[PDB]
Amino acid sequence: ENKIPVLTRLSDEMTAVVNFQQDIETQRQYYLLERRFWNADAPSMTTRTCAVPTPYGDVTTRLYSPQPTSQATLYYLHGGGFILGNLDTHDRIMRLLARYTGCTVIGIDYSLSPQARYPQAIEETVAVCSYFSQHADEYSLNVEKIGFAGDSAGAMLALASALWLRDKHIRCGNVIAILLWYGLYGLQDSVSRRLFGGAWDGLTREDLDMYEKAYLRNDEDRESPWYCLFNNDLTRDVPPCFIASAEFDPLIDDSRLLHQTLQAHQQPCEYKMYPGTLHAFLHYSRMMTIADDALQDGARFFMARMKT
Ligand SMILES: [Cl-]
Ligand SMILES: [Cl-]
């Protein structure tokens, strides 16, 4: 095997997490199990769980209110390779983003693959944003300014959904920022995909292939511009993007390409690589100060756009 371990290059914090640990419904229940510890001791706050209609049927949302009033609404799309996760697996991340931005965070429990396929989760997200834009007063929201945020597959969904709003001309509020932690955006291969990914992070080429084959309707979708975002128009009208990457993540090149593409067209963005980290590190704030730092950095980016 040409890939070498990244263990000795990981930060002390990251190494501590690696030392701690370690059918589809069963895999989902194990993911809930692995995630439960990391979501403990999350910021206390008001929360409402609301069913929202979509073209596919209702989708559950959770509204986190860190203060009684809000000056923007941040929609959060969780990771899990399109096949795992829910609002509880990312509860702490969402509560912390709400605390740090001072704004309502709305988590979307989008339909998982392989039962759902692309672009269902995007369409559900758009339906949710449209619903809350129409019912803002009822839910005590400020929908004049909105953002999207997500980790891993959720970062894919966040950017894809914002591009869908743009491309289909759907008005849901001014999209002031998109917060993207270690996303994938359509690369099929790359330097980092060949150097990194293994048993330690569950991101071998084989794993990445499996997630894709669960998500797409068929192989033609690999080129669709809301899956391979690099096939969309990234030369204009892209909302400001905060692009965070993990150093030893096979997906880092997807973030680098997104950054470099937006830069080439003077599209607004910030890029930051978090040194010594593996993919998925945003979940480990209870043990890793850098995970909390990455959440704060994204929150600061969002807040700076509530103004400018
Ligand atoms: Cl499924
Ligand atoms: Cl870069």
UniProtKB/Swiss-Prot annotation:
It is an enzyme of class 3 (hydrolase). It comes from the Bacteria. The active site is at residues 152, 249, 279. Its main location: cytoplasm. Disulfide bonds: none annotated. The keyword Cytoplasm applies. Keywords: Cytoplasm, Hydrolase, Serine esterase. The keyword GTP-binding does not apply. It is found in: Cytoplasm. Pfam families: Abhydrolase_3. A motif (Involved in the stabilization of the negatively charged intermediate by the formation of the oxyanion hole) lies at residues 78-80. Its EC number is 3.1.1.-. One of its GO terms (molecular function) is short-chain carboxylesterase activity. GO terms for cellular component: cytoplasm. Homodimer. Interacts with MalT and MelA. Belongs to the 'GDXG' lipolytic enzyme family. Displays esterase activity towards short chain fatty esters (acyl chain length of up to 8 carbons). Able to hydrolyze triacetylglycerol (triacetin) and tributyrylglycerol (tributyrin), but not trioleylglycerol (triolein) or cholesterol oleate. Negatively regulates MalT activity by antagonizing maltotriose binding. Inhibits MelA galactosidase activity. PANTHER family: AB HYDROLASE SUPERFAMILY PROTEIN C4A8.06C, ALPHA_BETA HYDROLASE FOLD-3 DOMAIN-CONTAINING PROTEIN-RELATED. This is Acetyl esterase. It comes from Salmonella typhimurium (strain LT2 / SGSC1412 / ATCC 700720).
